[PDB]
Design a protein around this ligand. Structure first.
Ligand SMILES: [Mg+2]
Ligand SMILES: [Mg+2]
Ligand SMILES: [Mg+2]
Ligand SMILES: [Mg+2]
Ligand SMILES: [Mg+2]
Ligand SMILES: [Mg+2]
Ligand SMILES: [Mg+2]
Ligand SMILES: [Mg+2]
Ligand SMILES: [Mg+2]
Ligand SMILES: [Mg+2]
Ligand SMILES: [Mg+2]
Ligand SMILES: [Mg+2]
Ligand SMILES: [Mg+2]
Ligand SMILES: [Mg+2]
Ligand SMILES: [Mg+2]
Ligand SMILES: [Mg+2]
Ligand SMILES: [Mg+2]
Ligand SMILES: [Mg+2]
Ligand SMILES: [Mg+2]
Ligand SMILES: [Mg+2]
Ligand SMILES: [Mg+2]
Ligand SMILES: [Mg+2]
Ligand SMILES: [Mg+2]
Ligand SMILES: [Mg+2]
Ligand SMILES: [Mg+2]
Ligand SMILES: [Mg+2]
Ligand SMILES: [Mg+2]
Ligand SMILES: [Mg+2]
Ligand SMILES: [Mg+2]
Ligand SMILES: [Mg+2]
Ligand SMILES: [Mg+2]
Ligand SMILES: [Mg+2]
Ligand SMILES: [Mg+2]
Ligand SMILES: [Mg+2]
Ligand SMILES: [Mg+2]
Ligand SMILES: [Mg+2]
Ligand SMILES: [Mg+2]
Ligand SMILES: [Mg+2]
Ligand SMILES: [Mg+2]
Ligand SMILES: [Mg+2]
Ligand SMILES: [Mg+2]
Ligand SMILES: [Mg+2]
Ligand SMILES: [Mg+2]
Ligand SMILES: [Mg+2]
Ligand SMILES: [Mg+2]
Ligand SMILES: [Mg+2]
Ligand SMILES: [Mg+2]
Ligand SMILES: [Mg+2]
Ligand SMILES: [Zn+2]
Lengths: 83, 181, 23, 69, 97, 116
RNA sequence: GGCGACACACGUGCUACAAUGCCCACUACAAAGCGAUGCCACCCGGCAACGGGGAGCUAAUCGCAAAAAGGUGGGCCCAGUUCGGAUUGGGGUCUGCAACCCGACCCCAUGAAGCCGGAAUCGCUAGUAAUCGCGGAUCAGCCAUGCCGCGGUGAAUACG
RNA sequence: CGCCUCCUAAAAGGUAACGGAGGCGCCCAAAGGUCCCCUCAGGCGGGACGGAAAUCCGCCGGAGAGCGCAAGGGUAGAAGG
């Protein structure tokens, strides 16, 4: 994974909106294309809509899913099985 | 009768605490241990090496008492089971032997139980008796790895003079039965 | 052999270094 | 008891690794055990052997508060 | 098992199954059909049905051609049979002297 | 169950034997035998009960082994499966998790071939 | 986002199933190439990947660089193992704006199938086959076990 | 087509029809004699593998179990183990 010497990566344009909502009190839905952004402690309790290439998937962030990436919760392939 | 620590611990510490905890008016009213019954369900000895004499030798080393054969009440298709077939072992421990067995059970056996998290609090008769089952006989200090051919466990019935689970829970835990919840 | 990373031979085949093949 | 069919019970020492010695009765007068009630993690208060960790996760990251505000 | 390729064409599972029932005629000869491979294709003139199959006594390679994809397949089968029958009997010719 | 929960192979050198514990590999084998000053070459049949409980005591407290270890790994997977992340999904359907190709192979994860 | 999907099926390859072997430690012997936001000596921190220092070299000068099999010693003792290294858990490194899908590498743990392979089928006639490692193009990094080269060790057999 | 059990059979016995239903043509060396001891099925709760049902423990449970085999009678204050 990403070097610890470097940052904990959030796209700033995603993060900024989080803190904005935190101040005034949360929350509206946040449509983002930032799959690469880490879920960050400030984001918990929000519901962020993560674009998977097609649809924006509503993801309610929790205490368990902090360390992860946003993409991990909006799967990019439809697979219901074979035959 | 033998001086045995657990038995002594029952009269010296356990009885007064029980008299205290529930306030019995009669010395006979306070929870007592009636018998410990050990049962090997076996029946893996139905046919095959229907020498479960290996197991009986094991049970006897554990309890100092030679188990008596149990036999099928009726014949059963699916378990492949004909009436009168030797399917298990059962030994009824009382008095000094009962105390000695429980003594080692608490101090040694249950600790040696794999990934032991404590006895199951809910396993009480409803009428004041308790039951637990074992996966191995290796749990016991009498049995070593050398002298054992296969893994067979047992059922254990601890019978109390207590009328309720509450009272029975009180007595058994006081004796040193380690409950998870 | 050559497929095991935790060995000298494996690190050669793979062309890397580490505890099991130092430089 | 019926005679000649039972193992005799003699005084016995069960010796644990923790140094615990148990005076009891058995068919083998001396026995060594790796564990006993006196040292077993479940019994001893709650001596949590190797992991008294407490998860540690997941806000336990805190590396650190450095994103801009 | 059996592989079917539809080159620069779309076909259905039905059509694929049809081909399998058609190749099945070769089972007549009671010899092993090893990795039979059918290639369906469209020329300007009509369809083309290609096949390569190996057996313990040789390979079968044949090409069938016809405006009707099914006939193209049937002619492919006809050419494959004639080959398989030669492979299976050519050795018997010289038993004497 | 000599040490530690598992009855390690006698007749074998103590370092090799120790690896027969879930959670103890060759790396950790060379470690515990230093920290207790026991010859790594000696056979388990030739240990002193002094050394045994020496070796035992350290190994069971330094690292998580057998049961409790399996419990965590499962909980870790049970967690990923429950939070519903991609890594989780792969575990739920029993498919490979570390980005391998599944068009062919992936047999260790998929199991032996199911005819159709 | 996908080209990386996964009930399945085929082709090419890698690593293997072990003792003519595996592991550790020490010690030899190449060729052809490549290298100025490049190749990196040497030093120090780290088990390590790597990081921070820092000399040299527009390179028959300096660097990649150690070749590996081998040699010498020690361990393993025929077991699904000190064979095999898949799968998965956890912790890190580096590149890159960014490694969720979808990178390579290191470390701890995990330690699968596999006991030499049905019908069928491929290569090779001598420095060949087999086996061993080294380089390069592409290239931020790399999914290279591929490709094009390079040398080391070095057979069997051809009646017809 | 002989034999056994129940019903028809009208509360003693007996009672017919090509009336309604089932069995027998064996078996057991103990499944016989006697002495001693023991008591079921089933329901609920509890107990490793163990399951609706194997063996174990507790409570309730007069007989609904058992008694080689049809049915009926009888039967644990035993004919049952
Ligand atoms: Mg008294
Ligand atoms: Mg209860
Ligand atoms: Mg009671
Ligand atoms: Mg034991
Ligand atoms: Mg290996
Ligand atoms: Mg007498
Ligand atoms: Mg096909
Ligand atoms: Mg197409
Ligand atoms: Mg098609
Ligand atoms: Mg053609
Ligand atoms: Mg025809
Ligand atoms: Mg012809
Ligand atoms: Mg291990
Ligand atoms: Mg994939
Ligand atoms: Mg893409
Ligand atoms: Mg492609
Ligand atoms: Mg198919
Ligand atoms: Mg195949
Ligand atoms: Mg390959
Ligand atoms: Mg292949
Ligand atoms: Mg072998
Ligand atoms: Mg194995
Ligand atoms: Mg196998
Ligand atoms: Mg191994
Ligand atoms: Mg990981
Ligand atoms: Mg990626
Ligand atoms: Mg071969
Ligand atoms: Mg070979
Ligand atoms: Mg052949
Ligand atoms: Mg030639
Ligand atoms: Mg080799
Ligand atoms: Mg190379
Ligand atoms: Mg290059
Ligand atoms: Mg490159
Ligand atoms: Mg990959
Ligand atoms: Mg009458
Ligand atoms: Mg009448
Ligand atoms: Mg009458
Ligand atoms: Mg009358
Ligand atoms: Mg008369
Ligand atoms: Mg008639
Ligand atoms: Mg008799
Ligand atoms: Mg008699
Ligand atoms: Mg009952
Ligand atoms: Mg029950
Ligand atoms: Mg059960
Ligand atoms: Mg049951
Ligand atoms: Mg009856
Ligand atoms: Zn102890």
């Amino acid at each position: 994974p990403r070097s610890l010497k470097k940052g904990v990566f959030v796209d700033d344009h995603l993060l900024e909106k989080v803190l904005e909502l935190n101040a005034k009190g949360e929350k509206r839905l946040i449509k983002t294309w930032s799959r690469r952004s880490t879920i960050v402690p400030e984001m918990v309790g929000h519901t962020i809509a993560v674009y998977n290439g097609k649809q924006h998937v509503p993801v309610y962030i929790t205490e368990n899913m902090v360390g992860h990436k946003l993409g991990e919760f909006a799967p990019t392939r439809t697979y219901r099985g074979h035959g | 009768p033998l001086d045995v620590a657990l038995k002594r611990k029952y009269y010296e510490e356990v009885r007064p605490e029980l008299i205290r905890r529930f306030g019995y008016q009669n010395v006979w009213e306070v929870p007592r241990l009636e018998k410990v019954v050990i049962n090997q369900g076996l029946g893996e000895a139905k046919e095959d090496a229907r020498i479960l004499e290996k197991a009986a030798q094991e049970l006897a080393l554990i309890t100092g008492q030679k188990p008596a054969v149990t036999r099928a009440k009726k014949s059963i298709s699916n378990f492949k089971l004909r009436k009168g077939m030797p399917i298990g072992l059962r030994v009824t421990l009382r008095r000094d032997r009962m105390w000695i067995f429980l003594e080692k059970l608490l101090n040694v056996a249950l600790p040696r139980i794999r990934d032991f998290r404590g006895l199951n609090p809910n396993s009480f008769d409803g009428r004041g008796n308790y039951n637990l089952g074992l996966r191995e006989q290796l749990i016991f200090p009498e049995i070593t790895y050398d002298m054992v051919d296969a893994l067979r466990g047992m059922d254990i019935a601890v019978v109390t003079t207590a009328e309720t689970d509450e009272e029975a829970r009180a007595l058994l835990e006081l004796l040193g039965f380690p409950f998870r919840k | 052999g050559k497929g095991d990373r935790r060995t000298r031979r494996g690190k050669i085949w793979r062309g890397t270094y580490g505890k099991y093949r130092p430089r | 008891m019926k005679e000649g069919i039972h193992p005799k019970l003699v005084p016995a020492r069960i010796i644990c690794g923790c140094g615990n010695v148990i005076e009891t009765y058995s068919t083998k007068p001396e026995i060594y055990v790796e564990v006993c009630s006196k040292c077993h993690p479940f019994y001893t208060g709650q001596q949590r052997f190797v992991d008294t960790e407490g998860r540690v996760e997941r806000f336990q990251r805190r590396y650190g508060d450095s994103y801009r505000k | 098992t059996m592989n079917i390729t539809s080159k620069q064409m779309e076909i259905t599972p039905a059509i694929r199954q049809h081909v399998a029932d058609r190749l099945a005629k070769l089972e007549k000869w009671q010899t092993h059909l090893i990795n039979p491979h059918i290639i369906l294709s469209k020329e300007p003139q009509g369809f083309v049905a290609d096949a390569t199959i190996n057996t313990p006594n040789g390979v079968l390679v044949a090409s069938g051609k016809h405006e009707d994809m099914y006939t193209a397949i049937n002619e492919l089968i006809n050419k494959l049979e004639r080959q398989l029958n030669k492979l299976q009997h050519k050795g018997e010719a010289r038993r004497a002297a | 169950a000599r040490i530690a929960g598992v009855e390690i192979p006698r007749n074998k050198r103590v370092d090799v034997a120790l690896t027969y514990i879930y959670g103890i590999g060759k790396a950790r084998a060379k470690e515990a035998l230093e920290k207790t000053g026991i010859n790594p070459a000696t056979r388990v049949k030739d240990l002193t009960e002094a050394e045994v409980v020496r070796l035992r005591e350290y190994v069971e407290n330094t690292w998580k082994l057998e049961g409790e270890l399996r419990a965590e790994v499962a909980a870790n997977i049970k967690r990923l499966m429950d939070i519903g992340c991609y890594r989780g999904l792969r575990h739920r359907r029993g498919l490979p998790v570390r980005g391998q190709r599944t068009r062919t192979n992936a047999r260790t994860r998929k199991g032996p071939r199911k005819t159709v």
